Amino acid sequence: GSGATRIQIALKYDEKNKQFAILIIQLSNLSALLQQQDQKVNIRVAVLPCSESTTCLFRTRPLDASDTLVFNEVFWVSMSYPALHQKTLRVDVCTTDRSHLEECLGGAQISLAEVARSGERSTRWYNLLS
Numbered sequence: 001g002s003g004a005t006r007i008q009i010a011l012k013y014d015e016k017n018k019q020f021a022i023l024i025i026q027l028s029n030l031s032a033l034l035q036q037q038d039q040k041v042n043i044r045v046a047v048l049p050c051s052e053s054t055t056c057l058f059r060t061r062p063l064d065a066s067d068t069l070v071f072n073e074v075f076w077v078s079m080s081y082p083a084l085h086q087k088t089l090r091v092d093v094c095t096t097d098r099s100h101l102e103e104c105l106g107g108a109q110i111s112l113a114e115v116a117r118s119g120e121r122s123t124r125w126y127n128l129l130s
């Protein structure tokens with residue numbers, strides 16, 4: 001069972017509150033990305049380039065590695081729609097431990113230039129690249 005590890009993500013812009021929502025849903029074929037097992041896994045979400053007025057880096061809770069791994073965490077970011085549209089979303093799948101050191105083994109980048117203003121939300125799957 002070796003192919004691409006994929007992450008499912010929903011994105012939605014809230015113009016009433018001028019905020020972007022990022023819903024990290026789940027991982028599939030995670031076995032393909034890990035050599036070891038039992039490992040803890042979290043997702044690191046970066047909204048780039050990093051606007052240093054607001055917070056641009058986020059992290060899921062860590063979970064025990066499983067080939068399919070559901071996180072269902074939402075992160076909200078304050079940002080005008082024009083600002084959102086210059087942005088790229090970086091999400092990396094990382095292992096971790098009591099050291100708290102991230103071992104981010106692969107990720108995806110998602111240009112946000114075409115996020116809709118409407119709030120009709122976009123849910124897509126993304127291949128990881130290491």
Ligand SMILES: CCCC(=O)OC[C@H](COP(=O)(O)O[C@H]1[C@H](O)[C@@H](OP(=O)(O)O)[C@H](OP(=O)(O)O)[C@@H](OP(=O)(O)O)[C@H]1O)O[C@H](O)CCC
Nearest residue numbers: 008010011012021022023025026070071072073074121123
């Ligand atoms: C960016 C918007 C913010 C937001 O709403 O995100 C909050 C999230 C998801 O909200 P929502 O209720 O709209 O999404 C459901 C969720 O994604 C579940 O996903 P999976 O676990 O991968 O199956 C789905 O069903 P449940 O097992 O009942 O939780 C369900 O998928 P579908 O619609 O059928 O495609 C979703 O309804 O809360 C978490 O689900 C927390 C669970 C209490």
